Every structure is written in C-alpha cells, then in structure tokens.
Amino acid sequence: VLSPADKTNVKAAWGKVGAHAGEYGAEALERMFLSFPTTKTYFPHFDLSHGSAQVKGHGKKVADALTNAVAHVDDMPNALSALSDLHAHKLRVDPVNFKLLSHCLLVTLAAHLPAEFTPAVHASLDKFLASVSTVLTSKYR
Amino acid sequence: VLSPADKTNVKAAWGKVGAHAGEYGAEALERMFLSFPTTKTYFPHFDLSHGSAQVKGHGKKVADALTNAVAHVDDMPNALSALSDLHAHKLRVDPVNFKLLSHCLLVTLAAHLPAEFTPAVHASLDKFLASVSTVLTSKYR
Amino acid sequence: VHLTPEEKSAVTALWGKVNVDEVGGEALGRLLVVYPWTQRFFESFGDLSTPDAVMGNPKVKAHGKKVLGAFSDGLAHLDNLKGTFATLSELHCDKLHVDPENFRLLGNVLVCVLAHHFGKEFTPPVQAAYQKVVAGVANALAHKYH
Amino acid sequence: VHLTPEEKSAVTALWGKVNVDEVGGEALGRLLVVYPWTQRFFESFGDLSTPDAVMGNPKVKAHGKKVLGAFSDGLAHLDNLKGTFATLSELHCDKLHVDPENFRLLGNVLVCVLAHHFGKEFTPPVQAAYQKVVAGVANALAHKYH
Numbered sequence: 181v182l183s184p185a186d187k188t189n190v191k192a193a194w195g196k197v198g199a200h201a202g203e204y205g206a207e208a209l210e211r212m213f214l215s216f217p218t219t220k221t222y223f224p225h226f227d228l229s230h231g232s233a234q235v236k237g238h239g240k241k242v243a244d245a246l247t248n249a250v251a252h253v254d255d256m257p258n259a260l261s262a263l264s265d266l267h268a269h270k271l272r273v274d275p276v277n278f279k280l281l282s283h284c285l286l287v288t289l290a291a292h293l294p295a296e297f298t299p300a301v302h303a304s305l306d307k308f309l310a311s312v313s314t315v316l317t318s319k320y321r
Numbered sequence: 322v323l324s325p326a327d328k329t330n331v332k333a334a335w336g337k338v339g340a341h342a343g344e345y346g347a348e349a350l351e352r353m354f355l356s357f358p359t360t361k362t363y364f365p366h367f368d369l370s371h372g373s374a375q376v377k378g379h380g381k382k383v384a385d386a387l388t389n390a391v392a393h394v395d396d397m398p399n400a401l402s403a404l405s406d407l408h409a410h411k412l413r414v415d416p417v418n419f420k421l422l423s424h425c426l427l428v429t430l431a432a433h434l435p436a437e438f439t440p441a442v443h444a445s446l447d448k449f450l451a452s453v454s455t456v457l458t459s460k461y462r
Numbered sequence: 463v464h465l466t467p468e469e470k471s472a473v474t475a476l477w478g479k480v481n482v483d484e485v486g487g488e489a490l491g492r493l494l495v496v497y498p499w500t501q502r503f504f505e506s507f508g509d510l511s512t513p514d515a516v517m518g519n520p521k522v523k524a525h526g527k528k529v530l531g532a533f534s535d536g537l538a539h540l541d542n543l544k545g546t547f548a549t550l551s552e553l554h555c556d557k558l559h560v561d562p563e564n565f566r567l568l569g570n571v572l573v574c575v576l577a578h579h580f581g582k583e584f585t586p587p588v589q590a591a592y593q594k595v596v597a598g599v600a601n602a603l604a605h606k607y608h
Numbered sequence: 609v610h611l612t613p614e615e616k617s618a619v620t621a622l623w624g625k626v627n628v629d630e631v632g633g634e635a636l637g638r639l640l641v642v643y644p645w646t647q648r649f650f651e652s653f654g655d656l657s658t659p660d661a662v663m664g665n666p667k668v669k670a671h672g673k674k675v676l677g678a679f680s681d682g683l684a685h686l687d688n689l690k691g692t693f694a695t696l697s698e699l700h701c702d703k704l705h706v707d708p709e710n711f712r713l714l715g716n717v718l719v720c721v722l723a724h725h726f727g728k729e730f731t732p733p734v735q736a737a738y739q740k741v742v743a744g745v746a747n748a749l750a751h752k753y754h
C-alpha cells in the first residue's frame with residue numbers, strides 16, 4: 181500500500197528516466213539474466229547475447245509498462261490487466277522472479293541516477309515495484 | 322489482488338464462520354504461539370497459557386478486524402488504517418509473522434469448517450489474508 | 463529435527479491414520495490451486511485449468527502419493543534429513559530450478575490437508591510438531607543450493 | 609561460494625575502493641528505511657523516525673561498519689562461509705530471532721549501495737559476482753535455523 185509521499189517519490193524518480201526507458205529496462209534485464217540465471221528459463225526464445233536487439237526491444241516494453249503503471253498508480257489492476265493475464269495466467273511466472281527483476285531495476289537506477297536514488301526514494305520505488313509485481317502475479321480476472 | 326470470485330468465496334466462508342469468528346481467532350493465535358514460538362516475543366505482556374482469557378479476548382479483536390476487512394474488502398487501506406498504524410508503525414511486526422498467523426487461521430478453518438474449506442475457497446482465503454497482511458504491514462499514512 | 467518424545471509419538475500415531483491414496487494428491491492439488499505459478503512445473507499433467515480439473519487429475523493424485531512417500535521417508539529419518547533428501551534436493555535445485563520458498567508452501571499446504579482430514583484431532587500441539595517436520599523437510603530439500 | 613578468477617579479481621578490486629566510513633552505514637540505514645520493521649531490532653539506537661534521522665544516526669553508521677566488516681570477512685573466506693559465520697548465525701538466529709529473509713534483504717541493499725557508489729563500474733558481471741557473495745553470506749548466517 182503506497183503512501184502519498186511514495187506516489188510523489190515514484191512519479192519524480194521514474195519521470196527522470198525519460199527518453200532512456202529502453203536503456204534502463206534492457207540493463208535491468210541483463211543484470212537479472214547474469215545474476216540469477218534461472219530467470220533465463222522464461223526466455224528460451226530470446227537471443228540473450230550482450231547488446232541483443234531483442235533484449236533492447238523487450239527492455240523498452242518493460243520500462244514503458246512501468247511508466248504506464250506510474251500514470252495509473254491508483255488503478256493498476258485495470259491498467260495492467262493484459263500484463264497480469266500474460267504473467268499470471270499464460271506464463272505462470274514464479275513471484276520470486278519479480279523480486280529479482282525489481283532488485284535489478286533498483287540497482288540500475290542507483291548506478292545511473294545517483295542523485296535521485298535517495299533512501300526515501302529507494303523505499304518508495306521498492307514498494308511501487310512490489311505493488312506492480314502483486315498485480316502482474318495475481319489472477320484477478 | 323482479489324478476483325470477484327475470491328471476494329464471493331471469502332464472504333461466503335466468513336459468513337459460515339459466523340458466531341465462531343472469535344473462537345477461531347483465539348485458536349489461530351494459540352496455534353501460532355505453539356508452532357512458531359518466536360511470535361511470542363510480540364506478546365511479553367500476555368498470559369499465554371492454554372485457555373488464557375487474554376488470548377481469548379485478543380482472538381475476538383483479531384476476528385472482528387477480519388470481519389471488518391471482509392465487510393470493506395475494496396476499501397481495506399481506509400477500514401484498517403488504525404490497525405496498519407499499530408502493526409507497521411508502532412509494533413513494527415516483521416511481515417513473516419503475518420504469513421504465520423494467516424497459515425494458522427487457514428489450519429483452524431480447515432479443521433472446523435471442512436465442507437466449506439474447498440481448494441477454491443482455501444485459495445481465496447489465502448489471497449484475502451495476504452492482502453490484509455500487506456495493508457497491516459505497510460506505512461501508508 | 464528436534465522433536466520431544468511426546469511430539470514424536472503424536473506425529474507417528476497421526477501419520478499411521480493418513481489416507482495414503484488421498485492426502486498427497488490433495489496436498490499437491492491444493493498447492494497447484496492456491497499457488498498457481500507451481501503449475502508451470504507440471505505441464506506434462508495436462509488439464510490443470512480449474513480446481514476440479516486439478517483435484518480429479520490422476521497424475522496429480524499419483525505424483526502426490528510420491529511426495530507423501532518422501533515426507534514419510536523424512537519422518538523415518540528425522541536425525542538425517544539432509545542425507546535422506548540429498549538426491550531429491552539435486553533434482554529440484556539443479557535440474558528443475560524450483561525456488562525453495564515453494565518447498566515451505568507445500569509443507570504448509572500438507573499441514574492444512576492434515577487439519578482438513580483430522581478436524582479437531584489436529585490439535586495446536588500436534589500441528590506444532592508437524593510444523594517442525596515440514597520445516598525440516600523443506601530445509602533438507604533446499605540444502606543443495608549452496 | 610565459487611567465483612571464477614576473473615570474478616574474484618573484479619570483486620576484490622572494487623571492494624578495495626569501498627568508503628568504509630559510509631557504505632556499511634548506508635546499507636544498514638537503507639535497510640531500516642526500506643524495510644521499516646527491521647527497526648524493531650535497533651531500539652537502543654534512539655531516533656530512527658525519519659530517513660534523515662536514520663542516515664545521520666552515529667549508531668547506524670558505526671554498526672553499519674561492523675556489518676561491512678562481516679561481509680569483508682566473507683570475501684576473505686569464500687570457501688568456508690558456514691564456519692566464518694557460525695558465531696554470527698548463533699547471535700542472529702538463536703539469540704535475536706531475526707527472520708532469515710531479512711539477511712537476503714540486507715545483502716541486496718548492500719548491492720544497491722555498491723551500485724550507488726560505483727555507478728557504471730558496477731557492471732552487470734560485477735553485480736553477478738557480488739550476488740553470489742551476498743547469497744552465500746545470507747545462507748551462512750541462516751545456518752543455525754537447524
């Protein structure tokens with residue numbers, strides 16, 4: 181459950197990503213695949229080599245979905261309904277993998293946006309990614 | 322995130338719980354204290370002996386809060402706001418303990434309401450208790 | 463696993479009354495219904511699309527009996543759970559990549575099934591003894607991660 | 609924990625550049641801010657009521673340095689993490705009853721702090737090597753939960 185300060189912090193830190201959505205998402209995915217190799221099992225059909233156009237294209241989609249989540253932060257079960265159908269009903273992703281990708285997203289933000297990554301903002305982003313993860317891993321439709 | 326079927330299953334099950342809500346709450350606490358003794362560290366001020374009036378009284382309060390959660394299942398952040406302040410800000414309960422109490426509640430319901438405790442209802446109740454646990458362990462004011 | 467003599471006697475006596483044809487299948491079925499991502503590991507079982515399809519699936523019933531056999535093996539070797547579950551830990555951890563939190567979930571669903579079958583006879587002290595057993599089995603199954 | 613010679617060199621080189629007065633305190637401070645229930649274990653530290661109060665607290669800074677020293681001890685004994693962390697496992701598990709998921713959380717907050725301090729030099733392969741280390745430390749600290 182996000183506080184009003186959390187939503188303010190998330191809108192501010194996420195908005196700073198801007199035109200670099202693809203770069204951040206793709207690096208978070210690369211960090212996840214290298215750090216937690218079992219996560220590769222969900223992407224047998226991807227070219228996972230470094231700098232793969234497929235991972236870049238997917239990173240942009242992941243980042244754009246989080247931007248959509250921020251734009252509808254109080255209505256995520258409706259805004260993300262198609263993503264929940266995909267991750268919960270079709271792919272059946274184990275929720276541990278969402279903790280892994282969320283951690284890799286925080287690591288990417290810490291590395292590339294140091295001034296924005298304050299302890300309060302880190303806390304708010306972690307809560308936001310946990311809320312998004314609950315929506316994407318729950319079958320509510 | 323609860324589905325419409327989840328909310329229906331929980332309302333139907335907790336209605337069958339009925340007058341025994343308080344008794345089930347006290348048994349779930351007793352099961353938690355015996356099965357996971359580290360949970361006793363939150364209650365140094367309680368008489369935790371079997372059939373303690375204190376545990377019975379507390380079980381009724383816990384069960385009444387869950388009844389309130391069922392009655393306001395789509396507005397739990399507001400309905401449980403005082404309880405989230407108590408558990409998340411004052412007591413600082415580690416969220417693992419909510420998984421422990423939730424499990425003990427499910428065990429109590431399975432033992433006492435076998436006909437109602439179908440796999441679909443068990444699934445809905447587990448999701449409902451996870452959602453209540455998220456509200457009570459989050460600082461959102 | 464450190465069980466008191468009275469807990470060891472209670473656990474053994476309840477276990478002897480378990481319906482071996484039903485309990486394992488109900489525990490595995492409930493895991494698949496309650497934690498639906500676990501179905502990803504059982505694509506060879508076919509239809510698992512509804513609770514009724516899961517519970518009536520003969521592969522769930524047969525596999526559940528094998529799982530129940532492994533918990534039985536645990537109860538017979540409470541002093542050497544790591545050794546007992548060594549090859550099974552290698553299968554789940556290195557070959558299947560099952561996240562170990564799922565082992566805790568199955569242990570707890572089994573406890574719910576035991577409560578469902580035994581009712582009020584699945585007392586808080588009997589449960590406490592079973593919680594020590596299922597925690598032990600879950601930890602032994604996770605031992606081959608590192 | 610197994611690190612390749614390349615990973616061992618990369619991990620050691622970055623670790624040598626860690627600001628010992630800041631990194632441990634930032635990791636512990638961030639744990640207290642991000643996972644606020646962890647504050648229950650640190651009542652003796654006084655004011656932890658706001659992120660600024662946590663981050664400026666000298667007890668958090670001093671205790672964080674001891675935690676950083678324990679991770680450093682882990683890096684010096686990658687072949688014997690269980691042995692290295694035996695007394696700290698007794699303290700955390702047997703005396704304090706810290707749930708072991710919190711050890712994984714602190715390991716991961718430390719990795720966030722290393723990324724925050726090192727920026728682009730905290731590359732995905734360097735992170736992967738550090739993830740093996742922190743998982744090893746967390747598992748070794750959790751050893752006494754049996």
Ligand code: HEM
Pocket residue numbers: 219222223241242243245246263266267271273277278281312313316
């Ligand atoms: C914040 C968490 C996540 C978000 C926002 C997210 C978002 C997305 C989006 C937007 C798509 C593309 C949907 C489309 O084009 O119709 C997608 C696909 C997918 N996601 Fe996720 N995802 C997340 C976490 C995960 C995790 C943790 C895994 C597994 C480790 C995962 C595995 C997949 C896979 C396998 C696909 C299909 C890829 C393809 O075939 O193109 N996702 N995800």
Ligand code: HEM
Pocket residue numbers: 360363364382383384386387404407408412414418419422453454457
């Ligand atoms: C579904 C989960 C839970 C619910 C609905 C719940 C509900 C309640 C309620 C209604 C109160 C009394 C508030 C008042 O009278 O003003 C309370 C108090 C308390 N709860 Fe919880 N609780 C839950 C879980 C937990 C857990 C997991 C723990 C710790 C293991 C815990 C520890 C406490 C403590 C220490 C108090 C204060 C008791 C006292 O001094 O009277 N609660 N809880």
Ligand code: HEM
Pocket residue numbers: 500503504506528529532533550553554558560564565566568569599600603
């Ligand atoms: C925690 C308690 C568990 C026990 C005691 C257990 C026990 C077993 C046993 C005895 C086997 C058969 C070994 C063989 O025939 O080679 C087995 C197979 C397997 N287990 Fe588990 N298991 C547990 C948890 C899990 C969980 C949580 C999952 C997945 C979420 C899982 C997935 C599997 C799969 C996929 C197989 C192979 C099935 C096949 O042959 O198609 N197990 N398990």
Ligand code: HEM
Pocket residue numbers: 646649650652674675678679696699700704706710711712714715745746749
């Ligand atoms: C996972 C990595 C961790 C490491 C390497 C670690 C390391 C340490 C060290 C080296 C000590 C000092 C021991 C001494 O002076 O005898 C310590 C004390 C302690 N740790 Fe940890 N710790 C970890 C995680 C945690 C977590 C997650 C918590 C609580 C959430 C925690 C709570 C404490 C407390 C309360 C003490 C005693 C502090 C005091 O003396 O007041 N630790 N830890």
Ligand SMILES: C[C@H](Oc1cc2cc(F)ccc2nc1N)c1cc2c(cnn2CC(=O)O)cc1-n1cccn1
Pocket residue numbers: 181182183184253254255256311395396397398399452453455456461
């Ligand atoms: C709209 C949402 O609504 C819910 C979020 C929930 C999150 C669960 F984790 C569990 C149940 C939830 N139920 C909601 N109604 C919500 C309502 C909130 C707060 C804080 N107070 N309130 C009430 C109020 O402002 O009037 C935070 C959120 N929130 C949005 C995203 C994540 N959390």
Ligand SMILES: C[C@H](Oc1cc2cc(F)ccc2nc1N)c1cc2c(cnn2CC(=O)O)cc1-n1cccn1
Pocket residue numbers: 254255256257258311312314315320322323324325394395396397452
């Ligand atoms: C009111 C609540 O609102 C939220 C619950 C949330 C739960 C998070 F875990 C995270 C974010 C949430 N945001 C909400 N707005 C909610 C809205 C839902 C569904 C299913 N669809 N919808 C949308 C719709 O009916 O129009 C389920 C819930 N729900 C209530 C209790 C638990 N979940």
